Structures are given as C-alpha cells and as structure tokens.
Structure 1
Amino acid sequence: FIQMSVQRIVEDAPPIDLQAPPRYLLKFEQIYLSKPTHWERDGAPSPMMPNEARLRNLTYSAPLYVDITKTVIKEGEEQLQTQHQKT
C-alpha cells in the first residue's frame, strides 16, 4: 500500500483544471514518506519510537509529501510551470 498503492492513487488522480481567462493546472507526480516523526511543543521534529507513541498516547504516523507541478496559462502565449517539491 505504501510503496505502490499510495503512489498509484496519486498518479491516477485527474489533474486539477481551473478556469477564471487565466487557466491553472495542478499535477501530482511523486510521493515521499518520512520516518514516523513527532513534533514537540517548540515545533522541533524528532523520530517517534513506537514505545514513546504507546507511552505518550501518540499516533505512529509518517509525514506524506507529494511533488506538485503547477502550470498557468494567461492567453498571452506564455506558460509558467512552477513545481512545489515535497508538498
């Protein structure tokens, strides 16, 4: 599920098409997972051990990131393609 299904689900999702007339497209390509992390009150990330999750009543969860490519067309024969890596 993590290695294949999640990536396939993101890949198989249709690109988001939006029209104003400027046109906007969003395409999600690559999926990244980090190791299970816990964020302290100060906001400092740290690896979350399963025992600490059990002791502190945390959820053993891994952050999920997706590479998103955004292309915008403003009917001015110019195309701007900006990619947000690991969203």
Structure 2
Amino acid sequence: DSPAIELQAEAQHTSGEVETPPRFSLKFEQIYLSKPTHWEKDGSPSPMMPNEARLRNLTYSAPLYVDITKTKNVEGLDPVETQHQKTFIGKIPIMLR
C-alpha cells in the first residue's frame, strides 16, 4: 500500500538543460524475513540465542529483505527494469515463542 517513488531530474542551475529529463520509478513488492542472525565485528553471521542476547546485552532481532524494482525511463526511449533482490533494510525485533 506504500506509494511508488517517482522521480524527475531538475538540472536548472546549469546551462544546456535537456527538455526531456530522464526519470526513475522505485517499487517495493516482496518481503523476506530470515531467522534472527547476529553479525559480529568481522561480519561473520551466526544464529543468535535469546540467552546469548540476554548475556551479551544484544537485541533479539531478525533482518528484513525487500525486492526493489527500478524502472529507468527516457522520453522517447524504452524504459529498462532492474531487480535489487534481498535488499537489507533493517532488523525487526522478534518476540519469543
């Protein structure tokens, strides 16, 4: 239900401005939730434990991944689609049991 991101370039501070600027559209369509996994200082993932989160004062959270559809459209040219799948956007906390 979120509105799609619609763009239009406005290079009004420079000379030779193109009358038909290129445009972008961004859409979010899919949500993937994984298991609660903690990344350490070296970046190695490991499945966190609620006892481990209690002892290390960590937050029992799981990362969320989103699929991004990016359409690049030029006035007078065919738009092209790009899929940025499994894009990490943040960790949501997980309630136990």
- Shorter-chain TM-score range: 0.7 to 0.9
Percent identity over paired residues? 80
Cα distance in 2 for partners of 1:76, 1:58 equals 53
Aligned partners of 1:40, 1:81: CA distance in 2, in Å? 35
CA distance in 1, matches of 2:76, 2:33: 38
- 2:30 matched residue in structure 1: 30
**How do residues 1-87 of structure 1 correspond to structure 2 at under 5 angstroms?**
12-20=1-9, 21-87=21-87
**Deviation at 1:76?**
3.1
| CA RMSD, 1 decimal | 0.7
* Structure 2 gaps, min length 5: 10-20, 88-97
Structure 1 unaligned spans of 5+: 1-11
* Mean Cα deviation higher: 71-80 or 60-69: 71-80
CA distance in 1, matches of 2:36, 2:76: 45
Which structure has the larger Rg over C-alpha atoms?
2
Query: How many residues are treated as equivalent by the alignment?
Result: 76
Aligned-partner Cα distance in 2 for 1:76–1:53: 55
Distance 1:46 1:76 in 2: 49
Q: CA deviation at 1:74?
A: 1.5
For residue 46 of structure 2, give the secondary structure of its aligned residue in structure 1: strand
Specify the code of the residue in structure 1 equivalent to 2:77. Answer: E
TM-score by length of 2: 0.76
Distance 2:76 2:84 in 1: 23
Identify, as 1 or 2, the structure richer in helix: 1
